[PDB]
């Protein structure tokens, strides 16, 4: 019954903000060049670029490299989002976040070089195994709660929580990736973005939202991890939004009473009643019965034994990732979108 460990957490978060604000004020630019990396294989694809496995040639270290087509970023209206992503990544520091190692740009593309996590996405493991046990789901949930506590204290909203964006490392721990929709927000923001299944009601209703949408998404994530499917799904997105805003959620019979109670409070359509967004804040989540067995400090310190460790086949193995057809990276003779990506 001691809470001087909250005084220490308060002090921790104060130091974290100091370090963040220094890097936020004086960000890093052009810390590398494309010819220093050996392109090996595509790990993922997107509407305005692709992610590749890469090898830092002088050192031999494997990294992931996100390649963004500047013209396509402009076209798809992701300019501000791309700038947010880089500026936030270079300023943040937390155990369960993927680290940005280098960033640079050329005539055609933007480049972000980051930690490679060969264990792959939680998504693939969840879809294969079917669903996770509640202790297994709780292990991952606890890491996301501490990560959101860290990010939110720096006034950052993540806005893209889902199994696809949670990588599993060699120790079985979470590495949160894809900061594409991350934004620094004191007060409200208005962009309609994220994945339909994971969208909070506020976002759908186009009214203005805050940090609370992250806590909603945590509920969706915990549900999907434990159930094997998300709480709101349908053939098309519009029918998914109807379900989200309705205030109706059905739980599998195997869900414990504690889990159902936590999720009722996280999947609270009224934002003044949603866990994480009340006066006690994140401690409502942390002190909940479902997390009664969670040693929060041991999790942060990575001292808890992981329930699942992915099969290690080397630092450059890509067997946990799907295969994609390989297009050559063409850099134009002329600079594209020089003004739009000036601060990158």
């Amino acid at each position: 019954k001691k809470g001087s460990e909250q005084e220490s957490v308060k002090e921790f978060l104060a130091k974290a903000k100091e370090d963040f604000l220094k890097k936020w004020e004086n960000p890093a630019q052009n810390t590398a060049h494309l010819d220093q990396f050996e392109r090996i294989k595509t790990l993922g694809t997107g509407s305005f670029g692709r992610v590749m496995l890469v090898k830092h040639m002088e050192t031999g270290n494997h990294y992931a490299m996100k390649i963004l087509d500047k013209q396509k970023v402009v076209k798809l209206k992701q300019i501000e989002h791309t700038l947010n992503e880089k500026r936030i990544l270079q300023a943040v520091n937390f155990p369960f976040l993927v680290k940005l190692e280098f960033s640079f740009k050329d005539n055609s593309n933007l480049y972000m070089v980051m930690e490679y996590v060969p264990g792959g996405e939680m998504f693939s493991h969840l879809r294969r195994i079917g669903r996770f046990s509640e202790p297994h789901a709780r292990f991952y949930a606890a890491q996301i709660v501490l990560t959101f506590e860290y990010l939110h204290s720096l006034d950052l909203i993540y806005r893209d929580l889902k199994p696809e964006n949670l990588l599993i490392d060699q120790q079985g721990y979470i590495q949160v990736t894809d900061f594409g929709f991350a934004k620094r927000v004191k007060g409200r923001t208005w962009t309609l973005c994220g994945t339909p299944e994971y969208l909070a009601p506020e976002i759908i209703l186009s009214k203005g939202y805050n940090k609370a949408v992250d806590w909603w998404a945590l509920g969706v994530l915990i549900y999907e991890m434990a159930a094997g499917y998300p709480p709101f799904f349908a053939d098309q997105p519009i029918q998914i939004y109807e379900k989200i805003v309705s205030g109706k959620v059905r739980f599998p019979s195997h869900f414990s009473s504690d889990l159902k109670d936590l999720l009722r409070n996280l999947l609270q359509v009224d934002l003044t009643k949603r866990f994480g967004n009340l006066k006690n804040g994140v401690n409502d989540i942390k002190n909940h019965k479902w997390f009664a067995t969670t040693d929060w400090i041991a999790i942060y310190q990575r001292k808890v034994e992981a329930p699942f460790i992915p099969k290690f086949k080397g630092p450059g193995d890509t067997s946990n990732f799907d295969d994609y057809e390989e297009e050559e990276i063409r850099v134009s003779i002329n600079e594209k979108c020089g003004k739009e990506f000036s601060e990158f």
Partner: peptide, 18 residues
């Protein structure tokens, strides 16, 4: 069963926002 409905909808694969 709900799980069967989830499989029946072709949205079991990786989902992209954009």
């Amino acid at each position: 069963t709900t799980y069967a409905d989830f499989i029946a909808s072709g949205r079991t694969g990786r989902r992209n926002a954009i």
